[PDB]
Write a protein that binds this ligand. Sequence first.
Ligand SMILES: *CCCn1cc(CCCCCCCCCCCC)nn1
Ligand SMILES: [Zn+2]
Lengths: 8, 282
Amino acid sequence: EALPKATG
Amino acid sequence: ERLLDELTLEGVARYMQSERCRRVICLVGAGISTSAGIPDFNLEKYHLPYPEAIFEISYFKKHPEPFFALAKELYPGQFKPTICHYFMRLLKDKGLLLRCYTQNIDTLERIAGLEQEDLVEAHGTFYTSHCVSASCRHEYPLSWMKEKIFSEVTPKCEDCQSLVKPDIVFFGESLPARFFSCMQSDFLKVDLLLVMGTSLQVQPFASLISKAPLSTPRLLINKEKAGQSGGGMDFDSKKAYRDVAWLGECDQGCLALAELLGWKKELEDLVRREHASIDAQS
Ligand SMILES: *CCCn1cc(CCCCCCCCCCCC)nn1
Ligand SMILES: [Zn+2]
């Protein structure tokens, strides 16, 4: 898991 | 649960001049920099699998050179902040700004006078860059990166020769930890949201509008209505009570709001002095 990612 | 007296710009101004409005948060996007010549996104010259690959971390990891070439091509001849940036600067100067959350990487907030404590650069910035090697992580300022970009030299670390990347969040990258640290405290205390120049289509930034308390007024200054669904924006229903939409250029809306607050002359002098000071030192 990772921190929330930049998504369009 | 209704703090605005009317769902107009004048109601927002009168609320800003009331005892309830002590902490204001700005959420800004590409629309506040378009009048400065910075594009709100050719590319054939870069031979990409798809046009969006230039903005994704996967392709940059594969081939970083097209990004730096495009950075030179789109590099603005001047970094002149807009009326909106200096309106936020006035908010800072008068003690009303709690935080500015920005989607932009153009550093115009910092050039306008906002400092690190005032800013959450949710998508990173060009203002600093770092060597990509985890055992080095050497930091370089904007002048170094600009000189490397314009000489068309791929930026390499002066200590270990590894690639040096601007501190920006590509699509597919995790947002910086400061975003998630600030959002926990800021959006429990916020009295007003000023959403300027964004259509709220990039996540998780957009979801920020639903973190505010349900009584917190939210003013949208944008060329189009956005955020309508969930704690979404409600400008036009019969149950509307706190959301105001001002449709047009962001500079114009900020000018009107500043005039309603009595700040017209000060904002004028600030913008003219700073634009002339940037034209001089150019
Ligand atoms: C979820 C992340 C959303 N996001 C990513 C970005 C930046 C993507 C790369 C932009 C490249 C800009 C090149 C330089 C232009 C001129 C300024 C120096 N934004 N939002
Ligand atoms: Zn290094």
